[PDB]
């Protein structure tokens, strides 16, 4: 992909990690949440070679 | 006493009773989502005050 940095945007809104005890066993539980979003705000500012590549 | 000749005898005494049952068990239980607590326009403390007001 060829682009200018201004053509696409990203937001990290939440990023947290948490420690608990398991209810069903003698275990620690570690869990983490990430909430984010992003958009190509200017589509002509991004050029893609092999776009169907999977 | 005068109509009973002049006779008397002891009656047994007795009680009446009522039971105060401590039998009402009421609860409030709710989630404040960590994402919603970030994404809403202001405080969510009002749901704790509303829960206390409901009880």
TrEMBL record, chain B:
This is Major capsid protein.
